[PDB]
Amino acid sequence: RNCIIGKGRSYKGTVSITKSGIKCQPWSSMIPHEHSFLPSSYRGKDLQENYCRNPRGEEGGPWCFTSNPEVRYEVCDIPQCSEVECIIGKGRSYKGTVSITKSGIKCQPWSSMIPHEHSFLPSSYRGKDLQENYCRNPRGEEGGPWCFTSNPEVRYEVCDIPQCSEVE
């Protein structure tokens, strides 16, 4: 996970370059800047290698001591986590808006019985977000999110949604 949530208190990624483009000094190094932010004094904050970190929780976000002797420390510019349209595992928790199947067929709305009559109504699956015609995996089947299809010859089909890469 190379994105930050909020100010990146939980950031444990591998970015090692500051906002202005300076290579980070290793946390366990005293060169060029002497400091006390050592891994042994900040257990759980993962002050490893020279990765940008926010061990105390400050505004700018994750930061590091810089290899430039003239710049003691500088914040790093890491993108905010914005991933959405992806699935974790087989997507029991998927609640995005993909509405086409793996074969390219437009999904039938869950509350519609046309062309396919079925039982997967929102009122019978409260909490599964069977809204609009979005792909869903309400019963937790290994096929991933699926939908009834608008092709009268294809009752249902799993959709094609890639795995996430920013969850944890």
Residue numbers in the entry: 4 to 171
From the paper:
The collected datasets enabled the determination of the molecular structures at 1.8 Å resolution and 1.7 Å for K1K1 and K1K1H6, respectively. Both proteins crystalized in space group P 1 21 1 with K1K1 having two molecules per asymmetric unit and K1K1H6 having one. Structurally, K1K1 and K1K1H6 are nearly identical with a backbone root mean square deviation of 0.8 or 1.8 Å, depending on which of the two molecules in the asymmetric unit of K1K1 is used for alignment with K1K1H6. Both proteins show an elongated “stretched-out” conformation with the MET-binding sites exposed on opposite ends and the N- and C-terminus located at the centre. Surprisingly, like the revelation of seeing the first structures of NK1 that presented a likely biologically relevant dimer, both crystal structures show a pseudo C2 symmetry around a central axis and present both receptor-binding sites in nearly identical orientation on either side of the molecule (located around residue Glu37 in the first kringle and residues Glu120 in the second kringle, equivalent to NK1 residue Glu159). One can envision a binding mode in which two MET receptor monomers are brought in proximity by binding on opposite sides of K1K1, forming a 2:1 receptor activation complex. Alignment of the first kringle domain of K1K1 with one of the two kringle domains within the NK1 dimer places the second K1K1 kringle close to the position of the kringle domain of NK1 protomer 2. However, the straightened conformation observed in the crystal structure of K1K1 “misaligns” the second K1K1 kringle domain through a rotation by 109.7 degrees and a translation of roughly 14 Å. No contacts between the two K1 domains or the kringle domains with the SEVE linker are observed. The linker is more stretched out compared with the two NK2 structures supporting our idea that it is highly flexible and therefore allows significant conformational freedom. This flexibility was confirmed with SAXS measurements of K1K1 in solution which generated an envelope that perfectly accommodates K1K1 volume-wise but only in a bent conformation.
